[PDB]
């Protein structure tokens, strides 16, 4: 704790958002290292503020989904802490770096909007903001991990690690990666 403010026990320093633009709604800690993916957190009042929120916590929040799981942050924090450990065993590294990478890789660059189009409503290829890219990515990965975990013996921490790792280097094994490519493919036509 006093030397450097590590994560559960992981270093914030030396993790670099390998992707210009995204830089910065992915919030590691260009100084902000903490200890735990839990905070009082008031993000809601402002439109932007959410970006400030540590990406780790942001990921943890998205974890607690589905009516029953709402509000179970302690459970998510527990899952997140485990996932980072599994990821680390799987590739060394900073699992936090692994997390960041998956996020950078998953945000749909291009997308589609349902432009009115007269009749046979066609869809217009539009580029996607970086806030959306981050927001969307974290969903994709969480929905990915949650969906996989449900009928299988494997635990969310594990499924999360699997989704995160495959995404970190976009294996396309991942549900999320396949989804992102689908959303983008759609963006390109339409145009």
């Amino acid at each position: 704790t006093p030397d450097i403010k590590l994560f559960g026990k992981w270093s914030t320093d030396d993790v670099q958002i390998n992707d210009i633009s995204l830089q910065d709604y992915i919030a590691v800690k260009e100084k902000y290292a903490k200890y735990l993916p839990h905070s009082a957190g008031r993000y809601a009042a402002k439109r932007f503020r959410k970006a400030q929120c540590p990406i780790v916590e942001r990921l943890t929040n998205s974890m607690m989904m589905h009516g029953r799981n709402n509000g179970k942050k302690l459970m998510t924090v527990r899952i997140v802490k485990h996932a980072f450990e599994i990821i680390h065993l799987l590739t060394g590294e900073n699992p936090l770096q692994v997390l960041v990478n998956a996020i950078i890789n998953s945000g749909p660059r291009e997308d589609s909007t349902r432009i009115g189009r007269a009749g046979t409503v066609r869809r217009q290829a539009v580029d996607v903001s970086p806030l959306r890219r981050v927001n969307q990515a974290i969903w994709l990965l969480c929905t990915g991990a949650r969906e996989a975990a449900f009928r299988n013996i494997k635990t969310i921490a594990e499924c999360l690690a699997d989704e995160l790792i495959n995404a970190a280097k976009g294996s396309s094994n991942s549900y999320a990666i396949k989804k992102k490519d689908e959303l983008e493919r759609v963006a390109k036509s339409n145009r």
Partner: protein, 64 residues
């Protein structure tokens, strides 16, 4: 006929379109060369200084 990928940085936030009001107008400094500057439509929440990844790099919209 074509492919490339373009980095562009937000210069000035124009206002909001889509009848639903969910697409934000943007003006982009062209990143690799500043001597370019164009109007693009956005899905997400966008604020000055952050970056778009343009596919089409001509086009340049308006309403819809």
């Amino acid at each position: 006929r074509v492919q490339p990928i373009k980095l562009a940085r937000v210069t000035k936030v124009l206002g909001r379109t889509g009848s639903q009001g969910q697409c934000t107008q943007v003006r982009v400094e062209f990143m690799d060369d500043t001597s370019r500057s164009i109007i693009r439509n956005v899905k997400g929440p966008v604020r000055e200084g952050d970056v778009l990844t343009l596919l089409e790099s001509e086009r340049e919209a308006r309403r819809l």
